[PDB]
Amino acid sequence: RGSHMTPKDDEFYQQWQLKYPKLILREASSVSEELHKEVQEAFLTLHKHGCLFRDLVRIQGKDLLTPVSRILIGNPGCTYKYLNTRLFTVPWPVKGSNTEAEIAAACETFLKLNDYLQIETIQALEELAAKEKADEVDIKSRAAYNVTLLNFMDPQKMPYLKEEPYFGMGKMAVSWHHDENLVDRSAVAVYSYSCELEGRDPDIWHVGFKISWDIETPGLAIPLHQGDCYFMLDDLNATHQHCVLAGSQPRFSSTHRVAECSTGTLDYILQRCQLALQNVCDDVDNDDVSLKSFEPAVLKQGEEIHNEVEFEWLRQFWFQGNRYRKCTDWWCQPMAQLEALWKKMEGVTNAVLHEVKREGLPVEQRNEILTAILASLTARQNLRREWHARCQSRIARTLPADQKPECRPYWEKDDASMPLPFDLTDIVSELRGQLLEA
Ligand SMILES: O=C(O)c1ccc(O)c2ncccc12
Ligand SMILES: [Zn+2]
Numbered sequence: 001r002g003s004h005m006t007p008k009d010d011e012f013y014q015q016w017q018l019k020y021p022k023l024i025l026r027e028a029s030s031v032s033e034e035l036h037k038e039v040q041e042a043f044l045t046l047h048k049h050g051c052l053f054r055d056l057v058r059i060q061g062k063d064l065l066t067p068v069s070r071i072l073i074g075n076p077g078c079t080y081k082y083l084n085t086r087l088f089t090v091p092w093p094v095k096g097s098n099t100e101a102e103i104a105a106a107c108e109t110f111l112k113l114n115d116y117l118q119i120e121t122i123q124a125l126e127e128l129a130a131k132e133k134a135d136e137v138d139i140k141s142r143a144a145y146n147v148t149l150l151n152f153m154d155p156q157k158m159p160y161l162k163e164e165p166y167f168g169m170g171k172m173a174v175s176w177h178h179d180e181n182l183v184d185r186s187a188v189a190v191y192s193y194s195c196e197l198e199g200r201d202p203d204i205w206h207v208g209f210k211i212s213w214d215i216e217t218p219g220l221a222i223p224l225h226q227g228d229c230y231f232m233l234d235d236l237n238a239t240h241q242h243c244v245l246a247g248s249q250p251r252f253s254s255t256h257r258v259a260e261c262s263t264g265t266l267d268y269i270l271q272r273c274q275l276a277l278q279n280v281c282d283d284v285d286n287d288d289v290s291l292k293s294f295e296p297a298v299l300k301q302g303e304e305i306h307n308e309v310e311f312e313w314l315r316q317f318w319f320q321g322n323r324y325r326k327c328t329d330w331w332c333q334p335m336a337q338l339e340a341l342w343k344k345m346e347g348v349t350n351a352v353l354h355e356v357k358r359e360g361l362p363v364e365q366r367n368e369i370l371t372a373i374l375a376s377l378t379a380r381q382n383l384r385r386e387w388h389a390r391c392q393s394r395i396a397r398t399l400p401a402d403q404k405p406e407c408r409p410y411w412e413k414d415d416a417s418m419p420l421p422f423d424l425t426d427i428v429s430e431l432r433g434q435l436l437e438a
Helices: 010-017 034-050 101-133 136-142 266-277 296-319 331-357 362-393 425-434
Strands: 023-026 053-059 062-075 079-082 085-088 147-153 171-178 188-194 206-211 219-223 230-231 240-245 251-257
Touching: 010 219, 023 219, 023 296, 034 101, 034 188, 034 251, 053 240, 053 425, 062 079, 062 085, 062 101, 062 171, 085 296, 101 136, 101 147, 101 188, 101 251, 101 266, 171 206, 188 266, 266 296, 266 331, 296 331, 296 362, 331 362
Parallel strands: none
Antiparallel strands: 023 230, 053 062, 062 147, 079 085, 147 251, 171 240, 188 230, 188 251, 206 219, 206 240
């Protein structure tokens, strides 16, 4: 049958070397007591301050609340997306940077831990190549952790856990998965903080590993003790799945990643909004939006940017109910700015819609405009329905008022502030009809 192996098994170590040599372990002994102290207290610090939330995530069409409580720390303006949920960094003091005293201290600590792990990770990948010898830049970028996802779980207060289905590894805190949204072949480092027979010891936390598509090959269950670190190197996260097996005591972790944020940063999205608004006459800011060109390429692109800021930025931010306010104000002004920018894009879709009706506009070029924008607008209407439904589902309403989702922006048709209804069913339908006239 399907079994697993631990340090109890004679085969365990050779199985490790032979089948998971890109998984590395650096025991609590390899880390200074000083760093242990600052890191452990920092975790406890963010706990006390209530900085950690279970995410309302999406899996195969279903709203699910992660058993695990989490928080994202890392470079300002940066984001990490998983299970359709874009987490926004609580900022850590990278250079040239400039929210509450203790919380701030905790972030700085996890940055320090970030520095050191980076150093360890580079050292291991160098060792790794010298083994495979029998570029420096690739090594550097693959260890350039711009984030850490902190996790917490107290099995005693969150005992609603699923049994491990293939190897008998027992209760799972995190189910078999690949880590999403990472740079290619980028390492991941994990600092592990536990608070105090046949098979794995159920009282103690483990990380589980299995080869993709493979349940005939015995999985590895590595025991995680207080302050132990381990590293997933090179293509290990692509070639294998991993899980977290729950012990009996609470445990925190810091899981540093190289987030693939090419479309995932404040800077990037602000720049995109700027590009869209290049098609707008910008002398003054008022609700009479006039556009420079109605050339299809440009309008399509403007409507796509409209969508990208609405759903991937605004709705994602407010669906979490602005939990981050508790930790920082960093994103408050940028999200007012992103909404202001988006609101202006609502005037653009609308001037496009005005133009399409305009009396003396040849049907050939009209049809051009429609063909350019149709996909965008129908994607906007489908994504609005979805996010509204994601905001109102039963599991959401059970969240405390400080995490209650916020469907935003959202306006009622009895609102003269917005030039277009929030519901586009009508408009889209008319556009489809026009595009099929004779
Ligand atoms: O160690 C953890 O607590 C952890 C939690 C959730 C994850 O997705 C992980 N992914 C890779 C390595 C560790 C983890
Ligand atoms: Zn993972």
